[PDB]
Amino acid sequence: KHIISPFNPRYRAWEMWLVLLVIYSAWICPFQFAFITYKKDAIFIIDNIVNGFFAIDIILTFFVAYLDSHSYLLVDSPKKIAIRYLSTWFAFDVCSTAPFQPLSLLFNYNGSELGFRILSMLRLWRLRRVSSLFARLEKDIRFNYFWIRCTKLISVTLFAIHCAGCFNYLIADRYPNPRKTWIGAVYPNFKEASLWNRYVTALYWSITTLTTTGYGDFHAENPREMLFDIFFMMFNLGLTAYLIGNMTNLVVHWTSRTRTFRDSVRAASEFASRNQLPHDIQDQMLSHICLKFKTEGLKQQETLNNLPKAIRSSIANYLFFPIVHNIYLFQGVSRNFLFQLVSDIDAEYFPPKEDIILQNEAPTDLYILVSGAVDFTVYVDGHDQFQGKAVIGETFGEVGVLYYRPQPFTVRTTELSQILRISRTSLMSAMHAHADDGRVIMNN
Amino acid sequence: KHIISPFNPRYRAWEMWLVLLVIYSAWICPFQFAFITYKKDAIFIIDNIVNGFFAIDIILTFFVAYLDSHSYLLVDSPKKIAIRYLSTWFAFDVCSTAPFQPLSLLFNYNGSELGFRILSMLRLWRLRRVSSLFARLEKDIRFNYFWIRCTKLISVTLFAIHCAGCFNYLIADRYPNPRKTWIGAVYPNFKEASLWNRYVTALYWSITTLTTTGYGDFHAENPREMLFDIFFMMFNLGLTAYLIGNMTNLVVHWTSRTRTFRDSVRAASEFASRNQLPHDIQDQMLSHICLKFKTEGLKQQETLNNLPKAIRSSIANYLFFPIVHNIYLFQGVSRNFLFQLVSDIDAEYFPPKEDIILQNEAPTDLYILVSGAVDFTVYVDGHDQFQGKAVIGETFGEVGVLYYRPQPFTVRTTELSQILRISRTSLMSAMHAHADDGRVIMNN
Amino acid sequence: KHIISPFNPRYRAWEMWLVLLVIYSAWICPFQFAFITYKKDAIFIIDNIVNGFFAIDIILTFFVAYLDSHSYLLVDSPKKIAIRYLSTWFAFDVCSTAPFQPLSLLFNYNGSELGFRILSMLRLWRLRRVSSLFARLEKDIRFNYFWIRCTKLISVTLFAIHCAGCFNYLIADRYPNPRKTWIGAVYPNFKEASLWNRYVTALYWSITTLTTTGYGDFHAENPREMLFDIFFMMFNLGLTAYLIGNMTNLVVHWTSRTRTFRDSVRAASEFASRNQLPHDIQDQMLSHICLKFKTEGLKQQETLNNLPKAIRSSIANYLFFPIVHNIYLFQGVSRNFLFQLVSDIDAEYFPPKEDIILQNEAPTDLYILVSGAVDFTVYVDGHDQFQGKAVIGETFGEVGVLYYRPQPFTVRTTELSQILRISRTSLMSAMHAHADDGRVIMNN
Amino acid sequence: KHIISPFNPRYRAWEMWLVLLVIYSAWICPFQFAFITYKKDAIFIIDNIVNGFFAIDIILTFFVAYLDSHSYLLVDSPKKIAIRYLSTWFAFDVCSTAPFQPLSLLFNYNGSELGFRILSMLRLWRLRRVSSLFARLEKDIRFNYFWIRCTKLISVTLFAIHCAGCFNYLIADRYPNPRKTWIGAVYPNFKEASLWNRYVTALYWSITTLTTTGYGDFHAENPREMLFDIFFMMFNLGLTAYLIGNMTNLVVHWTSRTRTFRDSVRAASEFASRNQLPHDIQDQMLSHICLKFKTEGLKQQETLNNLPKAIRSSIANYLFFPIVHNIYLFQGVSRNFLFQLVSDIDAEYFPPKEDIILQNEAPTDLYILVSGAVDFTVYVDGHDQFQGKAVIGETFGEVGVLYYRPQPFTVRTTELSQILRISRTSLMSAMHAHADDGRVIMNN
Ligand SMILES: CCCCCCCCCCCCCCCCCC(=O)OC[C@H](COP(=O)(O)OCCN)OC(=O)CCCCCCCCCCCCCCCCC
Ligand SMILES: CCCCCCCCCCCCCCCCCC(=O)OC[C@H](COP(=O)(O)OCCN)OC(=O)CCCCCCCCCCCCCCCCC
Ligand SMILES: CCCCCCCCCCCCCCCCCC(=O)OC[C@H](COP(=O)(O)OCCN)OC(=O)CCCCCCCCCCCCCCCCC
Ligand SMILES: CCCCCCCCCCCCCCCCCC(=O)OC[C@H](COP(=O)(O)OCCN)OC(=O)CCCCCCCCCCCCCCCCC
């Protein structure tokens, strides 16, 4: 219709500008509540320009498409747009837009009272535009997760230091008795003096109790600050148990790859020590785990067991398709038979001096050497050698279909392919009875 | 029999009222132990009305059915009811009901002594009605788990602040020497003065050491408070290691859905970067993981692999039964053959521009388009198109039973069904040899 | 041979007595190092009786069998016993037995010096008998794990409070300058006075910094205590990060059963809300998860998938063997055919009003009602009913071997057995072609 | 070519020497920044000898092979070596080598200024040689993981104590007002006195706030130290939430073997208590879990399900190959038939008095006794006995191919082999129709 979708450029840059008017309007919202208690006319225009840019956006979000939850498609219908916005965030977001301190200055008051500037704390209710941006950026795959989760953990404590260093200056500044307050016991005057733009003393108190260091030079004196310190030191129990529990969740997400690798190396050194294995086979099982971690990641088979059928079969056709193409065992065969390279477990990456195929074995699989070198041997000491692109196991459908002639083992560092009795024995039926003819030509 | 079962309304509202008489009777139980040490006749009637409502419930729970543990059925037998209650919570719950301070006032005493009002601390033994309600509400599926586990974590610390701010006023109030106590060193009188209903000073001390802030304005002076601070600061080691360990368990339960999603996106970007994949296939595997998370949740296949046989087969008959009904390949077929839509993996939700079926493939499955659109193509650039309810893979049991004619790929956002060679090839035997006749009519 | 095995009664009660002489000899080992610096003749006999009971056990452990690591059998050979004990714990355990303070009093000294009573700190090296008992009791299945792991966490901190409250009294008691120490700044004399058997002041200092409360009434004054507080406050970083990390491991072991239950309920309420399921099928899938948790535990199928072959088949022969015995479909059949009740998935426990078998289905399984009641119905509203021990699905090998006549659904609370086409169709071969004869007699 | 590979001995010992010149050059880098503010000529030669050994290594790393990331092979090409080093760590590592304090002494200055010795803090940028050594040693399997991860956790806090105890002495030493600083309020002079080589006071302040103990004897006085304490106490929130989250990760890696063992024992005692099993079968299922943990580890089947095909088949040929060799059922058979001992589940280790084979069962497997003893019995009380190397189940391919004659059960402690109907029934095809002849000879 005549509705703008909630995507680029005239809306995802307007929404990024209203975030900068929430970070500002949640900094001066408890700061002018305590320190700058005049608010005559100097900052008065910025807090009304900003409050005007949040009245436009009440109008503007009756024209956004909102991306329906049960259909996963955009809704372009100005009635269902309207009933949704009027039921979730209209009675909440119009109570943060109507001016109480600027506009209702004209009735009787002087722009300052206790139960009249507390109504200006509803400009902290527009913080949901920032909290619903951290929820959106966590699922955006082009943004990091360790540096969004810590930005959410930093911005919460920076707001808890600020909003409780300005709520403990109001208890001291509005005490009818003399300086028997937390700041008055060491700095006896602290008013109309001591450089009001440097409120570092009020933040130094808040960081000392939120981190639970506690020096005791600033502490509660009157029973008004004993109530506030009880309600603040119960908040800091819940805060530091939330930062520690979140950083514990992040360290586990940090170091889970290197820890489950050191679990499987440990479990394969417990196995080769209980059974008193020789050193010549313990090195073959430990060099393989180290090379599987360097090359195949940690969970690669679980990664591409979730791709449906055609994302997986298109990965295996960019990868090693001209490897299985130009070998002699499939030469002059049709395109559609070498379009079944969909069960190649090509994640081999064998280390040097590792046996791929033993001397005699149940001949389960052929291997295709992608890059590297392999040296055949016979029962005591023989010598044959395969080159950098050949096949090393093709005598599992011929005169030795119950045995193996050589015992190959790598020399440099070799990547193989491992086609395993599902595309030569369990693929009798599709095409290519010609492959069994191409093998006997090489044996002359 | 004549026995009331432990369910609604005359028992699950009576049990909710005795919880409010435990929250009260665990607040004034250490409060009148220390501050209001008179207890002449003012609060005396409320602590005996409440103590009478706990004598009724000793009688009443000889008539409750209790829901046997090895049979999972209610026991209505007034003898086995009686032996169970007399062996678990009778010698414990009659020691919290007999009045020691009210009733044994009449022998010799004045209602106050050290070893006589400590016997009134057995009214803290009725706290098991609250602790066995948090265990019941955690397994009730109509109550939340993140806001029951934090209510249990708040009520434990609120009781630890209260019961140790009233046990450290008794050490100061009952010290025979003058004000060389923790409160006497700063407020030298603090007795018969300083507004006894405002005991905020005793809670301000307890919150300062339980959170381990520690200001040092209130500290131990005499060796009676040095013993109590040792036994209290060893409790706060075990308390804050229990709140942090529980909130770490809750944050892991909070953010496990978005963290294992960002693990699988990371593992599929490590795979497409080691193998140097082109950008045109990396976008197909990354847009699929993002859409599988939005629609199929996280573990949906593990959810409905635990439903037995008929909960699962009734889900698949409300869902997409008139989808597989009115298509041409099953038209005029019996009801009982299209009552085997029990292996439809209908959780497709394919993104736009994703290939469902390649050009040539092992023809494993037919697909039924539920909602969306799909455009067929030929080897270079062709064009055919399926509508919003048709079948896009039905040539896997006919003239191309070893191949595929088109290569379909989505355009809008499409949900499919994927019946896969278990209800057309491995269902030769039940019924419907007519389905192979309905296909040749559409090919004319 | 003539060797005692390391088991009951004359050795596992002697070893439990030497543990009580380690708990004692690790309490007075830093206590007489600092406070009771005389040690003339009063406690002198107990520290030599105890030191004699540890010289017997050097002799005695040349006659213990020790239970070999690679063979899991006891070694009774007094030579290999000897080489093992002489290589692990002989040069360590004879350095904790030879008396330096008692026995070498006779050369020149008065039983006290700095570099002579530090050699009596090697009586802390016999703590390995306690540390190797916590490792043994953790794998003993008749002892708890939550109350052994916390006893190890309590005994470590109780020793860290004691051994660092006695090492910070030696810095104050042996300072050549006057009372400008941590205790001397508030209690100026503190020597030959202030009730030496009450060293609570030295423990009150240690608990204040180990829990990191910190009051500042006792702090370091001289640069000897500034060095000790640096080496102690680096130990308390490693200590409280070890208690919090261990209690986090215990809370996860505490509450893993109720948390993964609330994960699977949540995942099945996300599934029934995205697909807009009716309320009459959402209650069937949610009442089943709640009853599977109450009765089948959490992981029962993973429990008895690890028992080898005959522990599992003997569980299923005590359980529900006279259930499958005396039914009509196996009546007059041999013992060895109803000795194949080894694939009965009897963990049914169906809730009320849950459908077991639909109206028409692939007839996969028969069910045997163990306890409860079941009511059959026909397509709209019919009525038949099975009793408390009958068979409800036996028409899957007869005239309806492609269908189902009724649609049973529970009424009370029912436990079933579910034999599923592996002991009636895939057991044609063993015995009992008579079972197909017993079915046609009941149909007359 | 003429290029040295990054391995032993002339490079992996040169790199270990430059680590000792980073540990030194990150200790005196903030130490001479604050305390030794002269730096005339005494330490001047060591900070230029060290700065010369880091100018050699800028030259030397244009000749190292670097082990390519996508090929896992060394690159010997002096052009691609050069473009890699010039793009990662050349503009970073030449800014830490050019002398600013020594070499630019000759222009105008006296070797000390604020914005001139801050440029000597770029000698902290050579710390990446230490941080990239902890990343390398974590994946080296010949080094431990619990004592590399704690060495990284100790070295971070030792640097945070040092670098913030020297940055808070510069605020006190360079304050133009008199001693109204943190150290000046208690030690009023502290300059040209109080033993400058003992800066323990500046570390005692830093350890008191980093561990959040907080005594209050040293606290901020001027508004320069109130800014530094805010920026430091926000760092200590992020530091102690990183040490606790890392030690929680290490304790879970510490005690995961004994915790999942106590989970499976608990889950098998919940199962044998709900079903009211007799004590004679509960002991058989609990003694088996305890012996499977002692011998088979925790995850042994998951260990050797990842070895490819020939590491696994060479483990089973060193292990129990002369066990299956010299038994009567395979005597005089070829080598290649007893080269298929690749499906032997030899991890039995049965406890005493445990039934291996019941009286009548589906005869699924034969067993070969490796070490131990086994006693046969008949239905009530019979007696036969197998020796220490015999076969105990071979009547599953003969006259009782639907039954079992004895019911063996162990007596001492027995390890078996369990060949299970895949090498006698599903190996009809390879060789050895002679094995069925060798069985009838033993039955005479
Ligand atoms: C130097 C100063 C300069 C800077 C000055 C300030 C600049 C401000 C700039 C703006 C900052 C942004 C502020 C808002 C950030 C957004 C916050 C947010 O999104 O947090 C939401 C968070 C939800 O949790 P999260 O982990 O995101 O959940 C994921 C799954 N939903 O939820 C939270 O935030 C949770 C926070 C934890 C709070 C714990 C409270 C525990 C309370 C326990 C009470 C105990 C009982 C007390 C009773 C005492 C009575 C006697
Ligand atoms: C009122 C008082 C009354 C009572 C008085 C005292 C009575 C004493 C009675 C005896 C008490 C028993 C004492 C011994 C108990 C046995 C201790 C034990 O077994 O602990 C071993 C434990 C091993 O760890 P655990 O988790 O058991 O391992 C499981 C897997 N192996 O290992 C541990 O213990 C670990 C302990 C943690 C220590 C952390 C140290 C961190 C160090 C940080 C660095 C310090 C040095 C820095 C130097 C660098 C300079 C910058
Ligand atoms: C206005 C301000 C004041 C307002 C006051 C309000 C009045 C209070 C209202 C009453 C309401 C609260 C009533 C009490 C709460 C009831 C909840 C409860 O008790 O829960 C039981 C809980 C069970 O544990 P949970 O983890 O739930 O177990 C799950 C699996 N069973 O178990 C627990 O809760 C366990 C408690 C944890 C404590 C652990 C600390 C013990 C450590 C001791 C260490 C000693 C070591 C000694 C070392 C010294 C060495 C020298
Ligand atoms: C007795 C005294 C003697 C003194 C001797 C001194 C000798 C020192 C010799 C040198 C010692 C080593 C120094 C270098 C340390 C080397 C280790 C290192 O840097 O490692 C990097 C480490 C990496 O992280 P790790 O978890 O290993 O990652 C694994 C997966 N990549 O990363 C880290 O280490 C991370 C650092 C810790 C994290 C700190 C978190 C702080 C964040 C909070 C900041 C808040 C900012 C607020 C913003 C306010 C905005 C207004």
SS3 B355: strand
Distance between CA atoms of residues B25 and B31, nearest Å? 10
- The H or E element that residue C172 is part of is helix C170-173
Distance between CA atoms of residues C171 and C193, nearest Å? 18
Spatial contact of C284 and B304, defined as CB atoms under 8 Å apart: no
**Cβ contacts of A293 within 8 Å, gap of 6 or more:** A261, D139
CA C75 to chain B, closest CA, distance in angstroms equals: 44
CA C112 to chain A, closest CA, distance in angstroms equals: 41
Structure token pair of residue A79: 């009635």
- Subunit contact D365:C311, Cβ cutoff 8 A: no
The resolution in Å comes to 3.2
SS3 D105: helix
DSSP, residue by residue, C23-40: HTTTTHHHHHHHT----S
Distance between CA atoms of residues C45 and C210, nearest Å? 35
Of all ligands present, the nearest one to the C-alpha of D256 is: 2
Pocket residue to mutate for ligand 1, from B158, B244, B258, most atoms within 8 A of Cβ: B158
- The H or E element that residue B376 is part of is strand B374-376
Distance between CA atoms of residues C261 and B239, nearest Å? 26
Q: Is the beta carbon of A419 within 6 A of some atom in ligand 1?
A: no
Distance between CA atoms of residues B43 and D230, nearest Å? 49
- Subunit contact A211:D237, Cβ cutoff 8 A: yes
For residue C134, the ligand 2 atom closest to its alpha carbon is 19
3-class SS string, C66-126? CCCCCCCCCCCCHHHHHHHHHHHCCCCCCCCCCCCCCHHHHCCCCCCCHHHHCHHHHHHHH
Of all ligands present, the nearest one to the C-alpha of A233 is: 1
3-class SS string, chain A? CCCECCCCCCCCCCHHHHHHHHHCCCCHHHHHHHCCCCCCCCCCCHHHHHHHHHHHHHHHCCCECCCCCCCCCCCCCHHHHHHHHHHHCCCCCCCCCCCCCCHHHHCCCCCCCHHHHCHHHHHHHHHHHHHHHHHHHCCCCCCCCHHHHHHHHHHHHHHHHHHHHCCCCHHHHCCCCCCCCCCCCCCCCCCCCCCCCCCHHHHHHHHHHHCCCCCCCCCCCCHHHHHHHHHHHCHHHHHHHHHHHHHHHHHHHHCCHHHHHHHHHHHHHHHHHHCCCCHHHHHHHHHHHHHHHHHCCCCCCCCCCCCCCCCHHHHHHHCCHHHHCCECCECCCCCCCCCCCCCCCCCCCECCCCECCCCCCCCCCECECCECCEEECCCCCCCEEECCCCECCCCCCCCCCCCCCCCCEECCCEECCCECCCCCCCCCCCCCCCHHHHHHHHCC
Query: Atom 20 of ligand 1 has which residue's CA nearest to it?
Result: A131
Chain A residues at the C interface, defined by Cβ less than 8 Å, are 70, 212-216, 244, 248, 274, 276
Spatial contact of C371 and C390, defined as CB atoms under 8 Å apart: no
Structure token pair of residue D356: 């291996």
SS3 C42: coil
CA B178 to chain centre: 53
The count of other CB atoms within 10 Å of the CB of residue C396 is: 21
Spatial contact of C418 and C348, defined as CB atoms under 8 Å apart: yes
Chain D residues at the B interface, defined by Cβ less than 8 Å, are 70, 212-216, 244, 248, 274, 276
- The H or E element that residue C435 is part of is helix C435-442
Spatial contact of B154 and B247, defined as CB atoms under 8 Å apart: no
Pocket residue to mutate for ligand 4, from D159, D162, D230, most atoms within 8 A of Cβ: D159
**Tokens 């120490």, located at residue:** C181
Spatial contact of D222 and D181, defined as CB atoms under 8 Å apart: yes
In this complex, how many residue pairs, one in chain B and one in chain C, have their CB atoms less than 8 Å apart?
A: 157
Burial of A347-374, coded b for 16+ CB within 10 Å and e otherwise, reads bbbbbeebbbbbbbbbbebbbbbbebeb
- Subunit contact B245:C259, Cβ cutoff 8 A: no
The count of other CB atoms within 10 Å of the CB of residue D220 is: 23
Q: Rg (Cα) of chain A, in Å, rounded?
A: 36
Spatial contact of A166 and A33, defined as CB atoms under 8 Å apart: yes
A346 closest CA partner among A327, A365, A330: A365
- Subunit contact A72:B413, Cβ cutoff 8 A: yes
Resolved by: cryo-EM
CA D145 to chain centre: 3
**Alpha-carbon separation of residue B422 from A167, B419, B428, C160, D120 (angstroms):** 69, 7, 9, 67, 74
Structure token pair of residue C148: 């052994």
Residues with CB under 6 Å of ligand 4 are A 154, 254-255; D 23, 26-27, 127, 130-131, 134, 152, 155-156, 158-159, 161-162, 234-235, 238-239, 242
Distance between CA atoms of residues D349 and C132, nearest Å? 26
Structure token pair of residue C303: 């429990």
DSSP designation for D376? E
Burial of D367-406, coded b for 16+ CB within 10 Å and e otherwise, reads bbbbebebbbbeeeeeeeebeeeebbbbbbbeeeeebbeb
Determine the residue among B73, B303, B312, B348 to mutate to test chain C binding: the one whose Cβ has the most chain C Cβ atoms within 10 Å.
Answer: B303
B309 closest CA partner among C415, C278, C272, C418: C418
Distance between CA atoms of residues B33 and B36, nearest Å? 7
CA B296 to chain D, closest CA, distance in angstroms equals: 29
Span from the CA of C143 to the centroid of ligand 1 (angstroms)? 42
Span from the CA of A86 to the centroid of ligand 2 (angstroms)? 61
DSSP designation for B351? P
Q: Is the beta carbon of B162 within 6 A of some atom in ligand 3?
A: yes
CA D158 to chain centre: 23
* C409 φ/ψ angles, rounded to the nearest 5 degrees: -155, 140
**Alpha-carbon separation of residue A441 from A84, A326, A328, A437 (angstroms):** 75, 16, 10, 7
B430 closest CA partner among A158, A41, A411, C361: C361
Q: Is the beta carbon of C29 within 6 A of some atom in ligand 2?
A: no
Query: Atom 1 of ligand 4 has which residue's CA nearest to it?
Result: D158
Query: Dihedral through CA D135, CA D140, CA D144, CA D150, nearest 10?
Result: 0
